[PDB]
Structure formats: structure tokens, C-alpha cells
Amino acid sequence: ATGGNLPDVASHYPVAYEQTLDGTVGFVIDEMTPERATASVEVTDTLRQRWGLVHGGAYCALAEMLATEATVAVVHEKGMMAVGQSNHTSFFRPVKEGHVRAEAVRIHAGSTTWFWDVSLRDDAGRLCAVSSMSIAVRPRRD
Amino acid sequence: GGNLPDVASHYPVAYEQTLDGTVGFVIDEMTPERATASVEVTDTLRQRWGLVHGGAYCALAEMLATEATVAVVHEKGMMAVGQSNHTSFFRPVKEGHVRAEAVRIHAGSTTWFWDVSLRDDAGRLCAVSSMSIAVRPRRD
Amino acid sequence: ATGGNLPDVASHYPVAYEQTLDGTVGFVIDEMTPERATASVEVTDTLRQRWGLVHGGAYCALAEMLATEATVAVVHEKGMMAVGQSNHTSFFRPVKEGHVRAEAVRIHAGSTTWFWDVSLRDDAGRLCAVSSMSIAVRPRRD
Amino acid sequence: GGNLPDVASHYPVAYEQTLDGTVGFVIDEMTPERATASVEVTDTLRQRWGLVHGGAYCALAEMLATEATVAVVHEKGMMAVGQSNHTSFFRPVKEGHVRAEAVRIHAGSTTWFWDVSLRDDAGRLCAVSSMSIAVRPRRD
Ligand SMILES: CC(C)(COP(=O)(O)OP(=O)(O)OC[C@H]1O[C@@H](n2cnc3c(N)ncnc32)[C@H](O)[C@@H]1OP(=O)(O)O)[C@@H](O)C(=O)NCCC(=O)NCCSCC(=O)c1ccc(O)cc1
Ligand SMILES: CC(C)(COP(=O)(O)OP(=O)(O)OC[C@H]1O[C@@H](n2cnc3c(N)ncnc32)[C@H](O)[C@@H]1OP(=O)(O)O)[C@@H](O)C(=O)NCCC(=O)NCCSCC(=O)c1ccc(O)cc1
Ligand SMILES: CC(C)(COP(=O)(O)OP(=O)(O)OC[C@H]1O[C@@H](n2cnc3c(N)ncnc32)[C@H](O)[C@@H]1OP(=O)(O)O)[C@@H](O)C(=O)NCCC(=O)NCCSCC(=O)c1ccc(O)cc1
Ligand SMILES: CC(C)(COP(=O)(O)OP(=O)(O)OC[C@H]1O[C@@H](n2cnc3c(N)ncnc32)[C@H](O)[C@@H]1OP(=O)(O)O)[C@@H](O)C(=O)NCCC(=O)NCCSCC(=O)c1ccc(O)cc1
Ligand SMILES: [Cl-]
Ligand SMILES: [Cl-]
Ligand SMILES: [Cl-]
Ligand SMILES: [Cl-]
Ligand SMILES: [Cl-]
Ligand SMILES: [Cl-]
Ligand SMILES: [Cl-]
Ligand SMILES: [Cl-]
Numbered sequence: 001a002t003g004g005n006l007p008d009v010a011s012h013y014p015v016a017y018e019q020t021l022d023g024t025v026g027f028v029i030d031e032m033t034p035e036r037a038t039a040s041v042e043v044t045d046t047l048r049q050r051w052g053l054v055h056g057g058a059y060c061a062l063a064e065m066l067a068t069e070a071t072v073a074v075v076h077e078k079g080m081m082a083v084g085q086s087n088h089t090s091f092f093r094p095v096k097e098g099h100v101r102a103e104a105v106r107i108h109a110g111s112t113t114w115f116w117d118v119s120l121r122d123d124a125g126r127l128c129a130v131s132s133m134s135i136a137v138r139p140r141r142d
Numbered sequence: 143g144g145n146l147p148d149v150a151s152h153y154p155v156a157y158e159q160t161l162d163g164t165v166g167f168v169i170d171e172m173t174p175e176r177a178t179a180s181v182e183v184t185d186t187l188r189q190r191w192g193l194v195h196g197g198a199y200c201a202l203a204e205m206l207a208t209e210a211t212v213a214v215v216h217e218k219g220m221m222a223v224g225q226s227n228h229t230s231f232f233r234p235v236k237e238g239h240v241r242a243e244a245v246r247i248h249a250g251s252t253t254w255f256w257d258v259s260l261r262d263d264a265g266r267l268c269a270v271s272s273m274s275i276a277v278r279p280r281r282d
Numbered sequence: 283a284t285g286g287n288l289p290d291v292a293s294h295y296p297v298a299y300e301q302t303l304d305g306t307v308g309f310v311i312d313e314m315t316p317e318r319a320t321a322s323v324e325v326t327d328t329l330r331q332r333w334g335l336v337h338g339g340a341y342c343a344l345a346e347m348l349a350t351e352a353t354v355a356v357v358h359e360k361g362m363m364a365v366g367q368s369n370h371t372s373f374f375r376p377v378k379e380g381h382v383r384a385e386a387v388r389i390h391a392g393s394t395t396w397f398w399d400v401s402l403r404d405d406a407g408r409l410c411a412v413s414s415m416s417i418a419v420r421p422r423r424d
Numbered sequence: 425g426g427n428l429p430d431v432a433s434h435y436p437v438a439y440e441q442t443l444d445g446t447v448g449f450v451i452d453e454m455t456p457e458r459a460t461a462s463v464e465v466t467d468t469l470r471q472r473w474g475l476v477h478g479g480a481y482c483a484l485a486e487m488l489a490t491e492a493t494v495a496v497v498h499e500k501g502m503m504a505v506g507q508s509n510h511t512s513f514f515r516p517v518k519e520g521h522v523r524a525e526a527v528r529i530h531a532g533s534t535t536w537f538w539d540v541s542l543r544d545d546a547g548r549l550c551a552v553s554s555m556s557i558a559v560r561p562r563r564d
Contacts, residue, residue: 006190014192019185021195024164045159049205050146052154055161056204056224061197065189068196084196085395086368086416088228088510090537090556092530108514108549112394112418113367115512115552117539127529130537132554134368134512136394225535226508226556228370230397230416232390247409248374252534252558253507255372255412257399267390270397272414274372274508276534288472296474301467303477306446327441331487332428334436337443338486338506343479347471350478366478370510 005029006069009076022065025058029069035106037070043097054095054128060087063118063131066104071114071135079140085113086134098123104133112137144179145169146209149216162205165198169209175246177210183237194235196269200227203258203271206244211254211275219280225253226274238263244273252277287311288351291358304347307340311351317388319352325379336377336410342369345400345413348386353396353417361422367395368416380405386415394419426461427451428491431498444487447480451491457528459492465519476517478551482509485540485553488526493536493557501562507535508556520545526555534559 001008003017004027017023025047030038041047041062049055064084071082101121108115118131143157144167157163165187170178179202181187189195204224211222241261248255258271283290285299286309299305307329312320323329323344331337346366353364383403390397400413425439426449439445447469452460461484463469471477486506493504523543530537540553 013190015185015188015190017190020188020190021165021186021198022189024186025161045155046161046164048155048160049162049208050153050155050157050160053223055201056208056227057197057201058161060200060204060227060229061195064196064200068189083193083234084231086228086230087196087200088226088370088554089200090226090554091224092532092537094223107552110514112420115514130529130554132510132512132552138394228414228510230414232392232397247412250374252560255374270389270414272370272372272412278534295472297467297470297472299472302470302472303447303468303480304471306468307443327437328443328446330437330442331444331490332435332437332439332442335505337483338490338509339479339483340443342482342486342509342511343477346478346482350471365475365516366513368510368512369478369482370508371482372508373506376505 007073027062027065032073034074037066037104039066040099040101042099056091059120059129060089062102063133066102067116067133068135070104075137081138081140082135085136087131089129089131091129093126093128095122095128147213167202167205172210172213174214177206177244179206180239180241182239196231199260199269200229202242203273206242207256207258207273208275210244215277220277221280222275222277225276227271229269229271231269233266233268235262235268289355309344309347314355316356319348319386321348322381322383324381338373341402341411342371344384345415348384349398349415350417352386357419363420363422364417367418369413371411371413373411375408375410377404377410429495449484449487454492454495456496459488459526461488462521462523464521478513481542481551482511484524485555488524489538489540489555490557492526497559502559503562504557504559507558511551511553513551515548515550517544517550
């Protein structure tokens with residue numbers, strides 16, 4: 001809703017932000033438009049793996065929530081549902097501390113699938129990882 | 143804690159504090175060619191819509207495939223890290239557990255590849271992850 | 283139809299097998315069931331790149347045609363259309379000569395998307411490449 | 425022929441005989457960080473249903489990203505080969521041309537990554553390919 005600043009498209013949500021994975025690791029959406037969205041997270045141990053680096057899953061999740069929610073922002077009101085269907089994240093350079101900043105750019109908005117390219121950077125602006133997200137858009141059963 | 147491979151004397155982050163320990167991932171079996179892990183679904187593993195977070199599946203696969211590689215290569219002076227993770231989602235999971243099984247399909251000198259299958263309590267294939275693990279010589 | 287032994291689901295096809303990319307490089311389907319299909323191709327220069335190895339695109343194409351056609355075999359008659367939506371091929375070992383043998387195993391058959399894992403092997407049975415194929419199934423406009 | 429980088433005295437397969445030369449791929453621009461190529465749609469590039477073969481897009485991207493890497497690294501004693509190719513299809517192409525543009529996003533010591541965009545004659549994004557290129561020291 002606003003806990004992590006996610007899009008307010010519903011009156012009630014099944015799980016409260018603070019309690020979700022997102023709330024737990026502290027993902028926060030910064031900008032959000034139909035074609036582009038941004039989010040970030042402060043690196044803490046909760047975001048890392050045992051070796052001291054940001055967990056690969058963390059980048060995937062950030063990209064996942066971002067691209068999906070960005071789709072949700074537009075289609076919800078149109079009676080649709082949006083869920084992640086494919087997430088392909090590639091790791092270029094590890095992140096040990098600071099933040100992870102994600103930028104999602106929409107590259108295709110089909111009737112059934114939206115596609116977003118997500119770039120994940122470190123505090124120095126280096127490209128640490130990228131995620132190609134494919135979002136399925138379907139009519140709500142609800 | 144998570145039953146991760148014990149390959150070193152000290153780890154920078156304690157299990158309980160890692161993302162793995164936070165969501166509750168636990169390794170069940172581990173061999174050079176195959177490994178398994180699972181996690182109980184809690185809200186910590188879900189997104190606001192009540193379903194298991196796509197990131198959760200990615201994370202499980204990533205840790206499982208990477209650690210299964212570390213298990214073999216660590217003792218050989220090598221480091222193993224995730225290079226690519228491609229997860230595809232077939233059916234959501236609302237509660238119960240997520241169980242992963244990683245099958246090694248290629249063990250190259252510089253890259254290992256694992257196919258990970260993620261299933262629900264009914265044994266249904268909910269998602270798959272194709273994991274590419276980079277293997278490199280440890281730096282001083 | 284049978285030129286490359288593709289599934290006979292229509293009376294007429296827009297392009298004749300021998301003239302398509304498939305016919306050109308010589309892809310031939312061997313077995314074909316709803317859950318699993320196989321195909322092969324003899325390596326010739328037409329399948330290679332300038333460095334003398336089987337072109338990465340060749341593996342992608344073989345996987346692509348196979349997984350799609352295998353879906354087509356079942357859904358066509360059901361009034362659907364099937365096209366490749368995502369193809370992720372990973373290369374483990376190059377192939378210089380002989381054949382490339384592909385085996386597609388269906389792992390998920392949703393209402394809108396089917397997913398097949400394709401393994402591409404050399405004459406010695408080695409796993410040279412794999413392709414994760416996502417096939418979109420939609421109702422024919424035709 | 426295809427305007428591929430001239431980096432060596434002899435090539436095992438002549439351009440015209442390769443898959444590239446057979447379908448008609450031609451490199452247009454090439455720099456270390458970006459390259460372009462295109463091809464005229466012919467039946468040789470299509471599948472039986474009359475659309476450009478998904479494999480055609482994969483192939484174009486693969487050759488373009490790989491050769492753009494070879495262009496830089498060959499002279500450095502390295503070999504470049506495709507390691508992973510992930511192509512996603514957004515809109516089919518029935519005739520005309522397919523134009524590709526490869527943008528380098530990471531140039532690591534062992535892996536280079538390129539984003540390839542494939543467009544039709546109307547400039548519409550028909551498909552994308554995420555190419556991972558392995559860079560290794562040449563073998564004797
Ligand atoms: C995959 C998908 C159907 C998904 O639909 P979407 O992402 O939601 O996009 P959307 O529904 O908004 O429509 C996009 C365009 O797709 C096409 N399309 C979508 N639905 C349909 C349909 N039911 N019937 C025909 N065309 C359709 C159409 O061109 C449409 O544009 P428009 O007519 O609406 O202006 C669409 O993105 C698409 O068609 N991508 C192109 C797929 C493609 O060309 N794959 C490669 C060729 S097929 C695989 C292959 O290589 C092969 C080789 C040999 C062989 O024997 C068989 C197959
Ligand atoms: C990518 C990689 C180098 C990664 O190495 P890895 O996963 O750690 O595996 P590993 O290093 O243990 O070696 C596996 C095999 O790869 C080959 N290989 C690995 N490193 C090397 C090297 N430095 N030099 C030569 N061969 C090598 C070799 O065949 C080796 O087998 P072996 O002789 O050691 O028994 C290896 O898996 C591989 O070579 N995969 C095959 C790559 C391939 O064939 N891609 C498609 C063709 S190249 C892309 C293309 O389509 C293209 C098209 C047109 C054009 O103009 C240019 C390019
Ligand atoms: C993607 C897709 C909709 C494609 O449909 P399909 O491949 O053709 O399969 P099919 O239509 O036959 O149905 C499969 C199952 O999907 C579900 N499903 C399909 N269509 C719908 C729909 N319109 N409404 C609800 N559930 C549906 C349902 O569980 C269905 O089973 P059943 O009720 O028919 O027995 C389906 O495969 C699926 O739902 N996969 C699971 C998607 C998923 O769980 N992604 C991860 C969670 S959402 C992304 C995320 O992490 C996130 C995080 C934070 C945040 O704030 C927002 C999002
Ligand atoms: C994959 C690869 C090693 C490939 O190397 P490359 O593409 O050729 O790039 P390059 O070799 O030039 O080096 C780039 C950076 O990678 C790092 N790196 C590369 N090789 C090494 C090495 N042998 N030792 C240490 N760092 C290295 C290093 O940070 C380097 O920067 P620099 O110090 O040289 O300036 C590099 O891109 C990389 O390290 N990517 C980051 C990998 C990553 O962070 N994956 C996610 C975390 S590990 C997977 C995971 O989530 C997990 C979770 C739980 C668990 O229990 C275990 C694992
Ligand atoms: Cl929120
Ligand atoms: Cl767009
Ligand atoms: Cl542990
Ligand atoms: Cl293996
Ligand atoms: Cl045929
Ligand atoms: Cl199945
Ligand atoms: Cl040439
Ligand atoms: Cl770059």
C-alpha cells in the first residue's frame with residue numbers, strides 16, 4: 001500500500017507488508033509509472049547469504065516484486081491479475097554492502113504478457129545484476 | 143542450521159541471520175549430483191497477495207544449486223557463485239511447503255549447471271529454475 | 283507434414299518444408315507424443331558457423347521447432363494455435379560434426395502455456411546443450 | 425561476406441556455406457560496445473506456418489553478440505563462444521526484414537553479456553535476446 005510504497009489498488013491485502021518477504025528484507029518502491037519503476041533496499045544480513053554477499057535470490061525477488069507490482073499498478077483497475085511467469089536474473093558483480101537499487105523498464109505490454117528489463121545497481125552505480133521479467137496478465141478469478 | 147555444507151571454519155554471516163535462515167530454508171540431501179531442500183510456507187515467504195513470493199523460489203534454487211557446487215569444489219580451492227538463474231512459474235503456492243530438488247546436468251571446469259524443480263505439498267510442479275553456477279579459483 | 287515428419291494437422295501449409303529453415307538445415311522429427319518428442323539433424327556446413335562448430339542458433343531452432351510442433355500436435359485439432367514465447371538455450375559443449383539429437387520432455391501443460399525441456403546431444407550421447415522452451419497456446423484467429 | 429570481423433587468416437567454414445550465409449545475415453555496424461546486423465526475410469528464414477522461425481532470431485542474436493566479442497578479444501589471444509541465449513518472442517514477423525541491435529552491458533574477464541533487440545520493418549520490437557558469451561584463453 002505504502003509500507004514499502006507498493007501500489008494502492010485494493011482496500012485490503014491478504015498479507016501485511018511488514019510481514020511479507022518484501023517487508024521483511026525492506027524493499028521500497030521509489031518511482032512508479034506504466035513504463036518504468038524503481039525500488040531499493042538497504043543491504044543487511046537479512047539480504048545476504050552465509051558468504052557475506054547479497055543473496056542471488058534477493059536480486060530476483062526485488063526484480064520480481066517490482067515488475068509485477070508495476071504491472072499491477074496499471075491492470076488491477078482494469079480487472080486483471082498480474083503474476084510473475086518467468087524471471088531470468090544474471091549476476092555480473094556481487095554486492096557486499098550499501099544498497100541495491102533496481103530499475104525496471106517496460107519493454108513489451110501485450111494483452112497476456114508484459115515484459116520488463118530490470119537493472120540492479122550498487123551504490124557506486126555499477127551494474128551488478130539484470131533480470132528479464134515476464135509478467136502474465138490474466139482476468140481476476142475474483 | 144540449514145544443514146548447509148560444512149566446508150569452512152568461519153562464515154561471514156550466521157545462518158540464522160542470512161536470508162536463508164530468515165525464511166527458513168533447510169537442506170535435506172546433498173551429493174555431488176543431486177540435492178534437496180525445503181521450507182515451510184510462512185508470511186515471511188509470501189508477497190502481499192498471499193502467495194509464495196516468486197523470489198522465494200529463485201532464492202531456494204540459488205542457495206541449493208550453489209551450495210551443492212560449493213560442497214564439491216570448496217575443498218579444491220575453488221569458489222562457486224550463482225551466475226544465472228532462470229525460474230519459470232507454473233502454479234502458485236499459497237501455504238504448506240515448497241520442496242526443491244536440484245539435479246546436476248553439467249559439471250564444467252568453469253560452470254556447473256543444475257535443473258531445480260520446486261513442488262508443493264501435493265507434489266505438483268509449481269516452478270522450475272535453471273541455475274548456472276560459476277566456478278573460480280579462490281582469491282587470496 | 284512428413285518432409286521432416288512434422289505433425290500433419292492441416293491440409294495445407296504456408297511454406298513447404300523443403301523451403302523452410304527446418305527443411306533447409308534438415309531437421310527431422312523422429313518420435314512424437316503429447317509428453318515427449320524427438321528429432322535430429324545431420325551436421326553439415328549449413329548448420330555450422332565460420333569457426334567450424336554447430337551454430338548456437340541451430341540448437342535453439344531445433345529445440346524451438348520441436349517443442350512447438352509437439353504442442354501443435356495436440357492443440358491444433360482443439361482449435362488452438364501454438365507459438366514459441368521464450369527459448370533459453372545453454373551451451374555446455376560444442377558439436378563439430380555428426381548429428382545433433384534433441385529430446386523434448388513436456389514438464390507443464392497449462393491452459394495458456396506449455397513448457398518443455400529439451401536436451402541436445404552429440405553422437406557420443408554427450409549433453410552439448412539444453413533449451414527451456416515456453417510455448418504460448420492461444421485460440422486461432424483463423 | 426556477412427561483414428564479420430576479419431580477425432583471422434583462415435576460417436574453417438566459408439561464410440556462404442555457414443548457417444549465417446545460408447539465411448543471409450549481414451553485420452552492419454560493429455564497435456566494442458554495440459553492433460548491428462540484419463537479414464531479409466525469405467522462406468529460408470521461416471517455419472512452415474509462414475512466420476520467421478524463432479530459431480532465426482536466436483541465431484542472429486547469437487552470431488551478432490558472439491562476433492562482436494570476438495572482434496575485441498581475438499587479438500588478445502582469447503576465444504569467444506555463446507554460453508547462454510535467452511530469446512523472448514513478442515510479435516511475429518511474416519516478411520520484410522529482421523534487424524538486430526546488440527548492446528554490451530557487461531564485459532567481464534570470463535563473460536560478456538549483451539542485450540539484443542530484434543525489430544521488424546516498422547521498427548516494432550518483435551523479440552529480445554539476452555546473450556551470455558564465454559571468453560576463454562585460446563587453446564594451442
Ligand atoms: C506469444 C504471444 C502469442 C503472446 O501474446 P502477447 O504477448 O500477450 O501479445 P498480444 O496478445 O498483445 O499480441 C501480439 C501479437 O502476437 C500475435 N498474436 C497474438 N495472439 C495471436 C493469435 N491468437 N493468433 C495469431 N497471432 C496472435 C499477433 O501478431 C499480435 O499482434 P496484433 O495482431 O494483436 O496486432 C505473442 O507475443 C506472439 O505471437 N509472439 C511471437 C511468437 C513467435 O513468433 N515465435 C516464433 C515463431 S513460432 C515457433 C517456431 O519457431 C517454430 C518453428 C518451426 C515450426 O515448425 C513451428 C514453430
Ligand atoms: C562455454 C564453455 C566454454 C564453458 O566451459 P565449461 O562449462 O566450464 O566447460 P569446460 O571448460 O569444462 O569444457 C567443455 C568443453 O568446452 C570446450 N571448451 C572449453 N573451454 C575451451 C577453450 N578455452 N577452448 C576450446 N574449447 C573449450 C571444449 O570442447 C571442452 O571439452 P574438453 O575438450 O575440455 O573435453 C563450454 O561449455 C563450451 O564451449 N560450450 C559450447 C559453446 C558453443 O558451442 N556455443 C555455440 C557456438 S558459438 C556461438 C555461435 O553460435 C556463433 C555463430 C556465428 C558466429 O559467426 C560466431 C558464433
Ligand atoms: C502464470 C500463469 C497464470 C499462467 O497460466 P498457465 O500456465 O496457462 O496455467 P493454467 O492457466 O492452466 O493455470 C495454472 C494455475 O495458475 C493459477 N491461475 C491461472 N490463471 C489464474 C487466474 N486468472 N487467477 C488466479 N489464478 C490463476 C491457478 O492456480 C491455476 O490452477 P487451477 O486453478 O486452474 O487448478 C500460471 O502458470 C501461474 O499462476 N503460475 C504461478 C505464478 C506465480 O506464482 N508467480 C510468483 C508469485 S507473483 C510475483 C511475485 O513474486 C510478487 C512479489 C511481490 C509482490 O508485491 C507482487 C508479486
Ligand atoms: C560470476 C562471475 C564470477 C563471473 O566473472 P565475470 O563475469 O567474468 O566478471 P569478472 O571475472 O571480471 O569479475 C567481476 C567481479 O566478480 C567478482 N569475481 C570474479 N571472479 C572472482 C573470484 N575468483 N573470486 C572473487 N570474486 C570474483 C569480483 O567482485 C569481480 O570484481 P573485481 O574484483 O575483479 O573488480 C562474476 O560476474 C560474479 O562474481 N557475479 C556475482 C555472482 C553473485 O553475486 N551471485 C549471487 C550470490 S552467490 C549465490 C547465492 O545467492 C547463494 C545463496 C545462499 C548460499 O548459501 C550460497 C549461495
Ligand atoms: Cl507497501
Ligand atoms: Cl512498452
Ligand atoms: Cl546451516
Ligand atoms: Cl553431471
Ligand atoms: Cl515435414
Ligand atoms: Cl506435463
Ligand atoms: Cl563474412
Ligand atoms: Cl559494458
